Design an enzyme around this catalytic site. Sequence first.
Site, short mmCIF file in Angstrom:
data_model
loop_
_atom_site.label_atom_id
_atom_site.label_comp_id
_atom_site.label_asym_id
_atom_site.label_seq_id
_atom_site.Cartn_x
_atom_site.Cartn_y
_atom_site.Cartn_z
N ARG A 1 0.87 -1.16 0.00
CA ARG A 1 0.00 0.00 0.00
C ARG A 1 0.91 1.22 0.00
O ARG A 1 1.78 1.34 0.86
CB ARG A 1 -0.92 0.00 1.24
N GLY A 2 0.72 2.07 -1.00
CA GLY A 2 1.48 3.31 -1.13
C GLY A 2 0.62 4.49 -0.75
O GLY A 2 -0.43 4.31 -0.12
N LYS A 3 1.02 5.70 -1.16
CA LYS A 3 0.24 6.90 -0.86
C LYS A 3 -1.03 6.99 -1.71
O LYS A 3 -2.03 7.55 -1.26
CB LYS A 3 1.12 8.18 -1.03
N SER B 1 -2.32 4.10 -3.80
CA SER B 1 -3.00 2.83 -4.13
C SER B 1 -2.68 1.67 -3.19
O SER B 1 -1.72 1.72 -2.42
CB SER B 1 -2.63 2.42 -5.55
N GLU B 2 -3.50 0.61 -3.30
CA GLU B 2 -3.30 -0.66 -2.59
C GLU B 2 -3.00 -1.66 -3.72
O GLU B 2 -3.69 -1.65 -4.74
CB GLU B 2 -4.56 -1.04 -1.80
N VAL B 3 -1.92 -2.41 -3.58
CA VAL B 3 -1.46 -3.33 -4.63
C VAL B 3 -1.71 -4.77 -4.22
O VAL B 3 -1.31 -5.17 -3.13
CB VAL B 3 0.02 -3.06 -5.01
N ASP C 1 9.79 9.26 -11.84
CA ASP C 1 9.93 8.49 -10.59
C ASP C 1 10.85 7.31 -10.82
O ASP C 1 10.60 6.20 -10.36
CB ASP C 1 8.57 8.08 -10.02
N1 ATP Z 1 3.47 -5.78 -12.30
C1 ATP Z 1 3.92 -6.17 -11.10
N2 ATP Z 1 4.33 -7.45 -10.94
C2 ATP Z 1 4.73 -7.86 -9.73
N3 ATP Z 1 4.80 -7.15 -8.60
C3 ATP Z 1 4.44 -5.88 -8.79
C4 ATP Z 1 3.99 -5.32 -9.98
N4 ATP Z 1 3.71 -3.97 -9.81
C5 ATP Z 1 3.98 -3.75 -8.54
N5 ATP Z 1 4.43 -4.85 -7.87
C6 ATP Z 1 4.78 -4.96 -6.45
O1 ATP Z 1 3.76 -4.38 -5.68
C7 ATP Z 1 4.29 -4.19 -4.35
C8 ATP Z 1 3.64 -3.00 -3.70
O2 ATP Z 1 3.97 -1.78 -4.41
P1 ATP Z 1 4.11 -0.38 -3.61
O3 ATP Z 1 4.21 0.82 -4.47
O4 ATP Z 1 2.91 -0.23 -2.67
O5 ATP Z 1 5.41 -0.51 -2.68
P2 ATP Z 1 6.98 -0.33 -2.86
O6 ATP Z 1 7.40 -0.63 -4.25
O7 ATP Z 1 7.70 -1.29 -1.91
O8 ATP Z 1 7.35 1.17 -2.46
P3 ATP Z 1 8.18 2.34 -3.15
O9 ATP Z 1 8.39 2.07 -4.59
O10 ATP Z 1 7.37 3.63 -2.93
O11 ATP Z 1 9.50 2.44 -2.38
C9 ATP Z 1 5.82 -4.16 -4.49
O12 ATP Z 1 6.39 -5.25 -3.78
C10 ATP Z 1 6.05 -4.24 -6.01
O13 ATP Z 1 7.22 -4.99 -6.31
#
Ligand code: ATP
EC number: 2.7.11.1
Length: 327
Positions: free
Chosen positions: A45-47, A49-51, A154
């Site tokens: 979860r970022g600022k 979205s929730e992934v 970014d």
């Molecule tokens: N297409 C994708 N396939 C696999 N994993 C993905 C994909 N897109 C995003 N992720 C994963 O989703 C997760 C959550 O993403 P999020 O932006 O919330 O956190 P983050 O990458 O750890 O933080 P930040 O980039 O701000 O330091 C991460 O572990 C990222 O690797």
Amino acid sequence: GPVPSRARVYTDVNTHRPSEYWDYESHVVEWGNQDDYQLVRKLGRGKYSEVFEAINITNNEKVVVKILKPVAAAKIKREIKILENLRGGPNIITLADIVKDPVSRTPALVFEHVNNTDFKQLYQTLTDYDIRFYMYEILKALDYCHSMGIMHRDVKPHNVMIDHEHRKLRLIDWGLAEFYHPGQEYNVRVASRYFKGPELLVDYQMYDYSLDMWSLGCMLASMIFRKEPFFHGHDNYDQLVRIAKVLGTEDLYDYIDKYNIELDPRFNDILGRHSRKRWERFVHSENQHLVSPEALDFLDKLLRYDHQSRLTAREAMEHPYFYTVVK
Ligand SMILES: Nc1ncnc2c1ncn2[C@@H]1O[C@H](COP(=O)(O)OP(=O)(O)OP(=O)(O)O)[C@@H](O)[C@H]1O
Ligand SMILES: N#CCc1c[nH]c2ccc(C(F)(F)F)cc12
């Protein structure tokens, strides 16, 4: 006031293309079926979205679902349009679908899943050859998106997925990406602190694709020198001081003079006076295996105060640092 600036490459892309290409507000979203996707586990979860990791039940293939937090709709349509414009481009993450999330009642972007290698393992074990190989793959993504009139804004290692087994790289997280329009003043509150270009730190808004090339240089410096991050600012002001301790203050003042920038007076008491440090000063027994004269020459041409003086992605691809990479 400040002197204007324009990119030295791809200035006309958004002029030559139809308005439909860059006018993301006018774009009509084609909505898919939310029931095609079954959520498996929360990944983060970022600022904004929730992934989630999910399964596309129409082909039983893994996908990643980014459920947007209720925020300004203009940012959402911009990311969708950019992802659609770039779809199929080299090393650009594929946007597979857009659905309305039944719970949040906001858009959920469905992406191709990348079985990515752990970030720490990549940082700790990629070889000199691997860094050159993957840097060349990032340059293909950046030259593509810049050639398509888009700046990522970014670029950082967490936004670059690598499935090392399949030598597969994808540039992700297009939420801060923007269309480049010559003469446009952009918000300087972009990129992560350690990757912010001097243009952002000195509040120069008329920036362009070359901001991505600075961020790429920060990523390269931290990799080859084994110093995470390379420029370790305590805040955005100390961030510029950290850069100035490496690149020197004379070139910083020349940059500010050229663009007629009014430097924040908060800098008068903290910038000090520094001379450029030769890149060899950062070499030590624990990073020597990743450093070469070609790596230092390449890094030198990315990490420049003057955004117009940095190598572009296409020029970077021609650099001797990549001669060893199998093409
Ligand atoms: N297409 C994708 N396939 C696999 N994993 C993905 C994909 N897109 C995003 N992720 C994963 O989703 C997760 C959550 O993403 P999020 O932006 O919330 O956190 P983050 O990458 O750890 O933080 P930040 O980039 O701000 O330091 C991460 O572990 C990222 O690797
Ligand atoms: N920093 C760090 C680790 C890391 C995560 N994604 C990457 C993409 C490319 C590179 C390259 F080797 F090319 F510098 C490194 C990483």
